[PDB]
Design a protein around this ligand. Structure first.
Ligand SMILES: CCCCCCCCCCCCC(=O)O[C@@H](COC(=O)CCC)COP(=O)(O)O[C@H]1[C@H](O)[C@@H](O)[C@@H](O)[C@@H](O)[C@@H]1O
Ligand SMILES: CCCCCCCCCCCCC(=O)O[C@@H](COC(=O)CCC)COP(=O)(O)O[C@H]1[C@H](O)[C@@H](O)[C@@H](O)[C@@H](O)[C@@H]1O
Ligand SMILES: CCCCCCCCCCCCCCCC(=O)O[C@H](COC(=O)CCCCCC)COP(=O)(O)OCCN
Ligand SMILES: CCCCCCCCCCCCCCCC(=O)O[C@H](COC(=O)CCCCCC)COP(=O)(O)OCCN
Ligand code: NA
Lengths: 626, 80, 79, 77, 80
């Protein structure tokens, strides 16, 4: 076999002129085991395909002629690798990947299989290995490498047309694969969008009854749901406002024009599978994503979504939010009043007197414990319904954890109260303190205070932690030095000296708080060094760093606030606690009224008005009444 | 935001202490306000049980209001 | 000149060790001033913990900024 | 602080580089695993008939334009 | 501290016969959009006279581009 591989590798047909003679004399064919690499299954056709110059290699035609003469072409052309790293790759894949139209045409003409799946480890999705995923099919391979002519040929050839709705081992179709290769750069977004559009038009022309975009992969995701969950901002933006001005396929659009006067026109957005789909909607996918998605905070700025969220807020959610805020304020006022008037006798529980104040006090206590139980079960319901991971409990969901911890302090206080312990007071005040700081949760619902609260969060998580690590190291070091110098004093302990040196930070430091030492100069030098390092350097540096940080988080803070309000809107819409279900957005309007068959479309559209003072063109309206 | 934090921690502290000279909402609010102007005490009373709770509350108040919020006000004014 | 302009951490760790050895020498000479040496070493021993902030990106960059603030702004102010 | 961001990052990277080189020089156990990777056949054709090996470092790249056929060393990916 | 010349030398690639061996950057394989490159590392981390990393790291503090030279392409990844 080495002579054949050498001849095809060098592209020298003169070495194989006697091939068919001795093959016929020996009664052998090129697809027998003796002409294949035992380790990989590589054959002479594949070697000829891999090596060529300027798209030309003449040995391939010779091999095809010899194979046709010996037995047949079906077993020779459709040879493939048999290892576990290039499994299923054949000559058609190589022809497409090499960007050679002629070889693809010749391979298809001689009976190549246009549904062969190349499912080796190289061609699958993985992190710690090289590879390139394209959906395993030659149609997906041609689509994902920006070769429009080859997909047109593969779909429209007479010898074997390709199956446009084929699915790989994961279940991805061509459109799933096109979503998968996007990476939110400019040129990639441009070509991915163009190829998506062309495949939709061709699929509509060839199969008018086929709905490609409804096909789901093994995870149950359509291409739009996959684009939303993976954070593909460009593909989502393209899909949600898609407009196709072409007869016989206008029903594929998702943005329509309803009417137009001179400068003013009205557009309709499709809104199907955005807020109601009963499988996995776009808003649920974006809002409840797992914090590792790249463009999590930016995806809600795509055009229809921001407006429909503002519409939901203005229509019915705002009043419910204000009602919840009012009820929480009443709860905290009652809790404060009940805790303020606690009795000061020993050993609870305390016997009630037949007097008015005791009745009001015990009623307040009952209401406080009731609210604690309520927030406890709300926390459990959150954890079960969302099923967050270990990472998500720390990098996300701060408010849920804070409200849950408040309820835990309340319940431990109840347990200690009925166990005859005065330490229940130690629990209660902590709950009370947390109860007031959680009032800042309601700053969302107002734009300026919500953005301000997001900025407070980012200051705590970025600047304060870095400050406090270095500060605590310096404080502990100088405290140990100073307490070691002191001998037989009042202070002479780590806690007292730590407190005394902490007092310098708040503008209350003494510099002469003790004299129980020998070596005054050592004491003064240590205190002056501490004061210079922490007070004059580090605090002013914290101010400077916060000033740097606040300049950079404006737009990010606004986007995070909008995501917070979106989560609030979705939770209120889901729960609603009054049996009401008036949660549809806009009218059930007729868009075109001409599907491919005689029926007419109604599609739950959302209306937006626009004004333009240039490009006085005529639009294809739906109605003549403005 | 500042008045919300001040009222919350004042209610917690005045609930903790008992019997004498600061067992009143006005006096404790004034004592915790003094931290903002650079005159806070940290040992202004001993009429309690649970010293560690008292110290933890005061340190949390000081970290949240004095070290975070005032310097943030300076930063925001510089932005404005 | 690179001793003054470069290699600060080597100088700081070496000065810490010098305070320790002077403390030992004073200790065995029946002097109480060994305490005066020892605490200085102890103080330096904690601040040199900042050497290990390299190895973490955010804390390493923060420590470099501290170093530049000390060398640029604090000197002019203190003069 | 507004000026020294990039300079601070570069100085930190130089500090970590010095740490890496000192750790390599000390090495603590007479181990050779600190050595660089991949003694690969590079071109295998010097001006003489001999072949060459070079201890190379591999880096992967992706480019969504200029679909040219690069002159690789091997046909197996 | 001649950073431009260093950047040129470390990723040099010459595409012509009889001069391929002069390159220091090579292409190992390429699929459609993906390709894999090789960098030389000869005399970067082991030469026994003066390697690039030792020369840059232990420089004399007066080199004009002391801190920027480690951003040249192979060296940052090698150190990581
Ligand atoms: C003893 C006394 C204790 C004092 C405690 C003082 C707390 C002050 C805070 C008051 C409570 C405010 C609140 O309710 O929590 C805030 C943040 O609070 C913090 O700063 C934590 C400090 C640790 C809301 O965070 P949120 O739950 O909305 O999560 C956001 C996601 O929705 C979004 O998708 C993104 O993932 C985004 O990164 C997330 O932010
Ligand atoms: C009681 C007494 C307390 C004294 C406390 C003093 C402050 C804390 C010090 C904590 C230790 C931090 C540390 O480890 O030291 C810092 C230096 O901090 C100072 O500036 C102190 C000024 C005096 C690291 O500097 P480094 O040695 O790493 O040198 C870098 C080179 O590598 C690089 O090539 C460049 O040349 C670069 O310009 C250099 O930086
Ligand atoms: C930015 C933060 C700055 C912090 C500065 C002050 C705190 C420094 C504490 C570190 C040193 C170790 C503490 C050891 C505890 C201890 O063993 O000392 C205990 C003290 O108990 C406590 O109050 C616990 C306080 C817990 C506070 C936790 C934040 C009893 O000593 P007393 O003098 O009070 O009573 C005896 C009177 N005859
Ligand atoms: C930036 C804000 C900083 C807050 C500073 C502290 C003030 C907040 C007080 C809120 C708590 C409720 C006040 C209750 C008033 C009250 O009932 O207390 C009154 C006090 O009267 C007053 O000075 C009126 C104060 C008017 C408040 C003008 C903002 C009498 O108590 P005395 O101890 O003085 O006398 C008692 C003699 N046995
Ligand atoms: Na003061």
């Amino acid at each position: 076999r080495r002579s054949i591989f050498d001849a095809v590798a060098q592209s020298n047909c003169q070495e194989l002129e006697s091939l068919l003679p001795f093959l016929q004399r020996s009664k052998k064919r090129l697809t027998d085991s003796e002409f294949k690499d035992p380790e990989t299954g590589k054959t002479c056709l594949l070697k000829a395909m891999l090596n060529l110059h300027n798209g030309q290699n003449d040995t391939i035609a010779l091999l095809l002629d010899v194979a046709r003469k010996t037995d047949s072409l079906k077993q020779f052309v459709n040879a493939s690798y048999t290892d576990s790293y290039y499994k299923g790759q054949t000559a058609l894949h190589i022809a497409i990947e090499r960007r050679n139209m002629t070889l693809v045409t010749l391979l298809v003409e001689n009976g190549a299989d246009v549904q062969a799946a190349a499912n080796g480890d190289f061609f699958k999705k993985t992190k710690g290995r090289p590879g390139f995923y394209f959906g395993e099919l030659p149609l997906s391979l041609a689509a994902c490498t920006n070769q429009l002519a080859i997909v047109k040929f593969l779909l429209q050839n007479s010898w074997q047309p390709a199956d446009i709705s084929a699915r790989d081992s994961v279940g991805n179709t061509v459109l799933h694969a096109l979503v998968e290769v996007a990476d939110n750069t400019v040129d990639n977004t441009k070509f991915v969008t163009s190829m998506y559009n062309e495949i939709l038009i061709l699929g509509a022309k060839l199969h008018p009854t086929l709905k490609l975009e409804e096909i789901t992969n093994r995870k149950g995701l359509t291409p739009l749901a996959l684009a939303a969950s993976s954070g593909k901002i460009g593909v989502l933006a393209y899909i949600l406002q898609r407009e196709i001005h072409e007869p016989e396929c206008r029903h594929l659009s998702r943005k329509f024009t309803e009417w137009a006067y001179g400068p003013v026109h009205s557009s309709l957005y499709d809104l199907s599978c955005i807020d109601t789909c009963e499988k996995n909607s776009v808003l649920e996918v974006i809002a409840y994503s797992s914090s590792e998605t790249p463009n999590r905070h930016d995806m809600l700025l795509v055009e229809p979504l921001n407006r429909l969220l503002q519409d939901k807020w203005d229509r019915f959610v705002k009043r419910i939010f204000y009602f919840n805020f009012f009820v929480y304020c009443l709860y905290m006022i009652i809790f404060t009043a009940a805790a303020y008037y606690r009795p000061v006798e020993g050993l609870p529980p305390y016997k009630l007197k037949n007097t008015v104040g005791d009745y009001f006090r015990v009623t307040g206590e009952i209401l406080s414990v009731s609210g604690g139980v309520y927030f406890f079960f709300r926390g459990i319901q959150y954890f079960l319904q969302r099923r967050p991971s270990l990472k998500s409990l720390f990098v996300d969901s701060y408010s849920e954890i804070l409200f849950f911890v408040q309820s835990l302090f309340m319940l431990v206080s109840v347990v200690l109260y009925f166990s005859q312990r005065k330490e229940y007071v130690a629990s209660m005040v902590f709950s009370l303190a947390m109860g007031w700081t959680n009032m800042l949760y309601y700053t969302r619902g107002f734009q300026q205070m919500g953005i301000y609260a997001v900025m407070i969060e980012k200051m705590i998580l970025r600047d304060l932690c870095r400050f406090m690590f270095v500060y605590l190291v310096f404080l502990f070091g100088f405290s140990t030095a100073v307490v070691t110098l002191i001998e037989d004093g009042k202070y002479n302990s780590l806690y007292s000296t730590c407190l005394e040196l902490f007092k310098f930070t708040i503008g209350m430091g003494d510099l002469e708080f003790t004299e129980n030492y020998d070596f005054k100069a050592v004491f003064i030098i240590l205190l002056l060094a501490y004061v210079i390092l922490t007070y004059i350097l580090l605090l002013n540096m914290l101010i400077a760093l916060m000033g740097e940080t606040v300049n950079k988080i404006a737009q990010e803070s606004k986007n995070i606030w909008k995501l917070q309000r979106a989560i609030t809107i979705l939770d209120t819409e889901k729960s609603f606690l009054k049996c009401m279900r008036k949660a549809f957005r806009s009218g059930k309007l007729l868009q075109v009224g001409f599907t491919p068959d005689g029926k007419d479309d109604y599609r739950w559209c959302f209306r937006v008005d626009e004004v333009n003072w240039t490009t006085w063109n005529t639009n294809v309206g739906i109605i003549n009444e403005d």
